């Protein structure tokens, strides 16, 4: 399927143990997609002071459309030293590995895969 319904655990930035997916734009987009498929991906909601506590390159989920079955359609955009790889809508959050942190909420998304 071109899209997959996912429910992403929303994590507090200070709980996150693994603060990014890797060391290059291509690697972090690769790893984010693998963790999304494997159900091992968390979401951190972006506010003042969040991104400097996480590791670049960043992987964002961004709204791709204006929401089947409650799932917002999203796509992945990476960012490294202020340059973004991809073009999409509003940020829903920054993706990180999930290694068992307790979430505060779930974000239902339809991921363009």
JSON list of C-alpha atoms in Angstrom, two decimals:
[
{"chain": "A", "resi": 1, "resn": "UNK", "atom": "CA", "xyz": [0.00, 0.00, 0.00]},
{"chain": "A", "resi": 2, "resn": "UNK", "atom": "CA", "xyz": [1.14, 3.61, -0.75]},
{"chain": "A", "resi": 3, "resn": "UNK", "atom": "CA", "xyz": [-0.17, 4.61, 2.74]},
{"chain": "A", "resi": 4, "resn": "UNK", "atom": "CA", "xyz": [-0.12, 2.83, 6.14]},
{"chain": "A", "resi": 5, "resn": "UNK", "atom": "CA", "xyz": [-2.28, 3.72, 9.18]},
{"chain": "A", "resi": 6, "resn": "UNK", "atom": "CA", "xyz": [0.02, 4.18, 12.19]},
{"chain": "A", "resi": 7, "resn": "UNK", "atom": "CA", "xyz": [-0.53, 5.27, 15.81]},
{"chain": "A", "resi": 8, "resn": "UNK", "atom": "CA", "xyz": [2.72, 7.01, 16.94]},
{"chain": "A", "resi": 9, "resn": "UNK", "atom": "CA", "xyz": [3.55, 7.20, 20.66]},
{"chain": "A", "resi": 10, "resn": "UNK", "atom": "CA", "xyz": [4.14, 10.87, 21.61]},
{"chain": "A", "resi": 11, "resn": "UNK", "atom": "CA", "xyz": [7.26, 11.14, 23.87]},
{"chain": "A", "resi": 12, "resn": "UNK", "atom": "CA", "xyz": [8.48, 13.95, 26.17]},
{"chain": "A", "resi": 13, "resn": "UNK", "atom": "CA", "xyz": [11.86, 15.20, 24.80]},
{"chain": "A", "resi": 14, "resn": "UNK", "atom": "CA", "xyz": [13.57, 14.68, 28.23]},
{"chain": "A", "resi": 15, "resn": "UNK", "atom": "CA", "xyz": [12.53, 10.95, 28.26]},
{"chain": "A", "resi": 16, "resn": "UNK", "atom": "CA", "xyz": [13.99, 10.15, 24.84]},
{"chain": "A", "resi": 17, "resn": "UNK", "atom": "CA", "xyz": [16.98, 7.76, 25.09]},
{"chain": "A", "resi": 18, "resn": "UNK", "atom": "CA", "xyz": [18.04, 7.70, 21.40]},
{"chain": "A", "resi": 19, "resn": "UNK", "atom": "CA", "xyz": [17.78, 11.27, 20.15]},
{"chain": "A", "resi": 20, "resn": "UNK", "atom": "CA", "xyz": [17.99, 10.69, 16.38]},
{"chain": "A", "resi": 21, "resn": "UNK", "atom": "CA", "xyz": [18.18, 8.09, 13.62]},
{"chain": "A", "resi": 22, "resn": "UNK", "atom": "CA", "xyz": [21.74, 8.57, 12.30]},
{"chain": "A", "resi": 23, "resn": "UNK", "atom": "CA", "xyz": [24.37, 10.77, 10.77]},
{"chain": "A", "resi": 24, "resn": "UNK", "atom": "CA", "xyz": [23.22, 11.71, 7.20]},
{"chain": "A", "resi": 25, "resn": "UNK", "atom": "CA", "xyz": [19.93, 12.94, 5.66]},
{"chain": "A", "resi": 26, "resn": "UNK", "atom": "CA", "xyz": [19.66, 9.69, 3.63]},
{"chain": "A", "resi": 27, "resn": "UNK", "atom": "CA", "xyz": [20.37, 7.50, 6.73]},
{"chain": "A", "resi": 28, "resn": "UNK", "atom": "CA", "xyz": [17.86, 9.24, 9.01]},
{"chain": "A", "resi": 29, "resn": "UNK", "atom": "CA", "xyz": [15.07, 9.08, 6.36]},
{"chain": "A", "resi": 30, "resn": "UNK", "atom": "CA", "xyz": [15.96, 5.36, 5.82]},
{"chain": "A", "resi": 31, "resn": "UNK", "atom": "CA", "xyz": [16.00, 4.54, 9.54]},
{"chain": "A", "resi": 32, "resn": "UNK", "atom": "CA", "xyz": [12.81, 6.58, 10.25]},
{"chain": "A", "resi": 33, "resn": "UNK", "atom": "CA", "xyz": [10.97, 4.58, 7.52]},
{"chain": "A", "resi": 34, "resn": "UNK", "atom": "CA", "xyz": [12.27, 1.23, 8.88]},
{"chain": "A", "resi": 35, "resn": "UNK", "atom": "CA", "xyz": [11.21, 2.14, 12.52]},
{"chain": "A", "resi": 36, "resn": "UNK", "atom": "CA", "xyz": [7.78, 3.34, 11.26]},
{"chain": "A", "resi": 37, "resn": "UNK", "atom": "CA", "xyz": [7.30, -0.05, 9.48]},
{"chain": "A", "resi": 38, "resn": "UNK", "atom": "CA", "xyz": [8.61, -1.98, 12.61]},
{"chain": "A", "resi": 39, "resn": "UNK", "atom": "CA", "xyz": [6.39, -0.03, 15.09]},
{"chain": "A", "resi": 40, "resn": "UNK", "atom": "CA", "xyz": [9.54, 1.26, 16.90]},
{"chain": "A", "resi": 41, "resn": "UNK", "atom": "CA", "xyz": [9.13, 5.01, 16.07]},
{"chain": "A", "resi": 42, "resn": "UNK", "atom": "CA", "xyz": [8.10, 7.78, 18.51]},
{"chain": "A", "resi": 43, "resn": "UNK", "atom": "CA", "xyz": [7.04, 11.38, 17.90]},
{"chain": "A", "resi": 44, "resn": "UNK", "atom": "CA", "xyz": [8.18, 14.48, 19.82]},
{"chain": "A", "resi": 45, "resn": "UNK", "atom": "CA", "xyz": [5.98, 17.59, 19.50]},
{"chain": "A", "resi": 46, "resn": "UNK", "atom": "CA", "xyz": [8.11, 20.59, 18.51]},
{"chain": "A", "resi": 47, "resn": "UNK", "atom": "CA", "xyz": [8.10, 23.62, 20.84]},
{"chain": "A", "resi": 48, "resn": "UNK", "atom": "CA", "xyz": [10.71, 26.18, 21.99]},
{"chain": "A", "resi": 49, "resn": "UNK", "atom": "CA", "xyz": [13.81, 24.30, 23.23]},
{"chain": "A", "resi": 50, "resn": "UNK", "atom": "CA", "xyz": [12.92, 20.83, 21.87]},
{"chain": "A", "resi": 51, "resn": "UNK", "atom": "CA", "xyz": [15.07, 20.59, 18.70]},
{"chain": "A", "resi": 52, "resn": "UNK", "atom": "CA", "xyz": [18.40, 21.65, 20.35]},
{"chain": "A", "resi": 53, "resn": "UNK", "atom": "CA", "xyz": [17.86, 18.66, 22.77]},
{"chain": "A", "resi": 54, "resn": "UNK", "atom": "CA", "xyz": [17.67, 16.24, 19.77]},
{"chain": "A", "resi": 55, "resn": "UNK", "atom": "CA", "xyz": [20.37, 15.15, 17.29]},
{"chain": "A", "resi": 56, "resn": "UNK", "atom": "CA", "xyz": [20.60, 16.37, 13.68]},
{"chain": "A", "resi": 57, "resn": "UNK", "atom": "CA", "xyz": [19.83, 15.42, 11.05]},
{"chain": "A", "resi": 58, "resn": "UNK", "atom": "CA", "xyz": [16.14, 15.68, 12.14]},
{"chain": "A", "resi": 59, "resn": "UNK", "atom": "CA", "xyz": [13.23, 13.75, 10.55]},
{"chain": "A", "resi": 60, "resn": "UNK", "atom": "CA", "xyz": [9.88, 15.60, 10.66]},
{"chain": "A", "resi": 61, "resn": "UNK", "atom": "CA", "xyz": [6.39, 14.34, 9.88]},
{"chain": "A", "resi": 62, "resn": "UNK", "atom": "CA", "xyz": [4.55, 17.09, 7.97]},
{"chain": "A", "resi": 63, "resn": "UNK", "atom": "CA", "xyz": [0.84, 17.21, 6.99]},
{"chain": "A", "resi": 64, "resn": "UNK", "atom": "CA", "xyz": [0.56, 16.29, 3.24]},
{"chain": "A", "resi": 65, "resn": "UNK", "atom": "CA", "xyz": [-3.24, 16.93, 2.84]},
{"chain": "A", "resi": 66, "resn": "UNK", "atom": "CA", "xyz": [-6.27, 18.72, 4.53]},
{"chain": "A", "resi": 67, "resn": "UNK", "atom": "CA", "xyz": [-7.80, 12.81, 7.45]},
{"chain": "A", "resi": 68, "resn": "UNK", "atom": "CA", "xyz": [-9.13, 9.27, 6.75]},
{"chain": "A", "resi": 69, "resn": "UNK", "atom": "CA", "xyz": [-10.48, 7.37, 9.84]},
{"chain": "A", "resi": 70, "resn": "UNK", "atom": "CA", "xyz": [-8.93, 10.09, 12.15]},
{"chain": "A", "resi": 71, "resn": "UNK", "atom": "CA", "xyz": [-5.44, 9.52, 10.56]},
{"chain": "A", "resi": 72, "resn": "UNK", "atom": "CA", "xyz": [-3.75, 12.75, 9.30]},
{"chain": "A", "resi": 73, "resn": "UNK", "atom": "CA", "xyz": [-1.89, 12.12, 6.01]},
{"chain": "A", "resi": 74, "resn": "UNK", "atom": "CA", "xyz": [1.82, 12.86, 6.55]},
{"chain": "A", "resi": 75, "resn": "UNK", "atom": "CA", "xyz": [5.14, 12.60, 4.77]},
{"chain": "A", "resi": 76, "resn": "UNK", "atom": "CA", "xyz": [8.78, 12.66, 5.94]},
{"chain": "A", "resi": 77, "resn": "UNK", "atom": "CA", "xyz": [11.05, 15.74, 5.56]},
{"chain": "A", "resi": 78, "resn": "UNK", "atom": "CA", "xyz": [14.68, 15.68, 6.89]},
{"chain": "A", "resi": 79, "resn": "UNK", "atom": "CA", "xyz": [16.63, 18.77, 8.06]},
{"chain": "A", "resi": 80, "resn": "UNK", "atom": "CA", "xyz": [20.44, 19.29, 8.42]},
{"chain": "A", "resi": 81, "resn": "UNK", "atom": "CA", "xyz": [22.13, 22.69, 9.21]},
{"chain": "A", "resi": 82, "resn": "UNK", "atom": "CA", "xyz": [18.94, 24.58, 8.24]},
{"chain": "A", "resi": 83, "resn": "UNK", "atom": "CA", "xyz": [18.34, 22.82, 4.88]},
{"chain": "A", "resi": 84, "resn": "UNK", "atom": "CA", "xyz": [15.22, 20.60, 4.39]},
{"chain": "A", "resi": 85, "resn": "UNK", "atom": "CA", "xyz": [15.05, 17.60, 2.03]},
{"chain": "A", "resi": 86, "resn": "UNK", "atom": "CA", "xyz": [11.45, 17.46, 0.99]},
{"chain": "A", "resi": 87, "resn": "UNK", "atom": "CA", "xyz": [8.64, 19.99, 0.83]},
{"chain": "A", "resi": 88, "resn": "UNK", "atom": "CA", "xyz": [5.35, 19.43, 2.74]},
{"chain": "A", "resi": 89, "resn": "UNK", "atom": "CA", "xyz": [2.83, 21.05, 5.15]},
{"chain": "A", "resi": 90, "resn": "UNK", "atom": "CA", "xyz": [2.76, 21.88, 8.87]},
{"chain": "A", "resi": 91, "resn": "UNK", "atom": "CA", "xyz": [5.09, 19.89, 11.23]},
{"chain": "A", "resi": 92, "resn": "UNK", "atom": "CA", "xyz": [3.21, 17.40, 13.52]},
{"chain": "A", "resi": 93, "resn": "UNK", "atom": "CA", "xyz": [6.52, 16.57, 15.26]},
{"chain": "A", "resi": 94, "resn": "UNK", "atom": "CA", "xyz": [10.04, 15.15, 15.03]},
{"chain": "A", "resi": 95, "resn": "UNK", "atom": "CA", "xyz": [10.50, 11.36, 14.82]},
{"chain": "A", "resi": 96, "resn": "UNK", "atom": "CA", "xyz": [12.86, 9.47, 17.13]},
{"chain": "A", "resi": 97, "resn": "UNK", "atom": "CA", "xyz": [13.48, 5.79, 17.85]},
{"chain": "A", "resi": 98, "resn": "UNK", "atom": "CA", "xyz": [11.12, 4.33, 20.47]},
{"chain": "A", "resi": 99, "resn": "UNK", "atom": "CA", "xyz": [12.94, 2.00, 22.90]},
{"chain": "A", "resi": 100, "resn": "UNK", "atom": "CA", "xyz": [10.20, 1.66, 25.61]},
{"chain": "A", "resi": 101, "resn": "UNK", "atom": "CA", "xyz": [9.72, 5.25, 26.85]},
{"chain": "A", "resi": 102, "resn": "UNK", "atom": "CA", "xyz": [6.19, 5.78, 28.27]},
{"chain": "A", "resi": 103, "resn": "UNK", "atom": "CA", "xyz": [4.17, 8.05, 25.92]},
{"chain": "A", "resi": 104, "resn": "UNK", "atom": "CA", "xyz": [1.90, 10.97, 26.94]},
{"chain": "A", "resi": 105, "resn": "UNK", "atom": "CA", "xyz": [-0.46, 10.45, 23.93]},
{"chain": "A", "resi": 106, "resn": "UNK", "atom": "CA", "xyz": [-0.79, 8.82, 20.50]},
{"chain": "A", "resi": 107, "resn": "UNK", "atom": "CA", "xyz": [-0.84, 10.65, 17.14]},
{"chain": "A", "resi": 108, "resn": "UNK", "atom": "CA", "xyz": [-2.84, 8.75, 14.43]},
{"chain": "A", "resi": 109, "resn": "UNK", "atom": "CA", "xyz": [-1.20, 9.31, 11.01]},
{"chain": "A", "resi": 110, "resn": "UNK", "atom": "CA", "xyz": [-1.56, 7.90, 7.49]},
{"chain": "A", "resi": 111, "resn": "UNK", "atom": "CA", "xyz": [2.09, 7.65, 6.34]},
{"chain": "A", "resi": 112, "resn": "UNK", "atom": "CA", "xyz": [2.88, 8.05, 2.62]},
{"chain": "A", "resi": 113, "resn": "UNK", "atom": "CA", "xyz": [5.27, 5.00, 2.32]}
]
